Design a protein around this ligand. Structure first.
Ligand code: LMS
Ligand code: NA
Ligand code: ZN
Length: 259
């Protein structure tokens, strides 16, 4: 079994030993250079259809927390944009920092945001998530930056349950959560082909990164930082700085949906 994390001894600089694709040709995240990204007038508009989303549970996995969805049918889907076909929402999670000046995985002109939300979806043409991750177009991850300012009302239900999943392996019922409350106003985005940003680092992702951050309050992000990477009864290691830094762009083009 693998023992990866974000520390000096098990962090991103170590991952390539168990997961050699860490040094691959389409790794994520990347820096988005806004003056190199090209507007692609042929991208179709992005369609986020989350009205029938059914959340189930929230889990501390020792790396982040995952809000899990019922993906047994096309409840909540992502379509359009760069995507061919239908991608089903399976879960969301975040990456965040120890301080407000870092925490995002993607960067924008080298700017780091306080956190980044990932809504993970799988291409329904492959039948299940495990099959989808073996395909170069198997996943679509919708990434949304967080900055500290005003509170995000749609985030508070998440914040308030974190006390009940402090440590690795803890979970709580998390039904009736509406992920529409986590979106910014604009769906303007950048897109490029990449990977999972955690082990196993599979090169199966179409990334769609929204240009507009959401604002969350300092109190909200402070509560993220009270989580623990460790298990119950173990010495406290605060769950902070669970982000991978930018990786080499290599042959890839980042496209913009907007001028
Ligand atoms: N063994 C595995 N096989 C396939 N997928 C796996 C996985 N472990 C985690 N994920 C997935 O990879 C995501 C992390 O990558 S990210 N930050 O969204 O780019 C996790 O949230 C899981 O959905
Ligand atoms: Na916003
Ligand atoms: Zn992620």
């Amino acid at each position: 079994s693998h023992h990866w994390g974000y520390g000096k001894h098990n962090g991103p600089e170590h991952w390539h030993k168990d997961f050699p694709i860490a040094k691959g040709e389409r790794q994520s995240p990347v820096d988005i250079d806004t003056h190199t990204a090209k507007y692609d007038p042929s991208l179709k508009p992005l369609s986020v259809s989350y009205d029938q989303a059914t959340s189930l549970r929230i889990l501390n996995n020792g790396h982040a927390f995952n809000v899990e969805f019922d993906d047994s049918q096309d409840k909540a889907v992502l379509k359009g944009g760069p995507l061919d076909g239908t991608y089903r929402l399976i879960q969301f999670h975040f990456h965040w920092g120890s301080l407000d000046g870092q925490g995002s995985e993607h960067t924008v002109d080298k700017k780091k945001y306080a956190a980044e939300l990932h809504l993970v979806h799988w291409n329904t043409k492959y039948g299940d998530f495990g099959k989808a991750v073996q395909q170069p177009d198997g996943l679509a991850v919708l990434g949304i930056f967080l900055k500290v300012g005003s509170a995000k009302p749609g985030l508070q239900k998440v914040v308030d349950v974190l006390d009940s999943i402090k440590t690795k392996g803890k979970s709580a019922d998390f039904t009736n959560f509406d992920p529409r409350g986590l979106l910014p106003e604009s769906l303007d985005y950048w897109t490029y082909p990449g990977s999972l940003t955690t082990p196993p680092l599979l090169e199966c992702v179409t990334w769609i990164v929204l240009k507009e951050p959401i604002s969350v309050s300092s109190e909200q992000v402070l509560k993220f930082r009270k989580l623990n990477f460790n298990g119950e009864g173990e010495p406290e290691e605060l769950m902070v700085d669970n982000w991978r830094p930018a990786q080499p762009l290599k042959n890839r083009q980042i496209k913009a949906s907007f001028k």
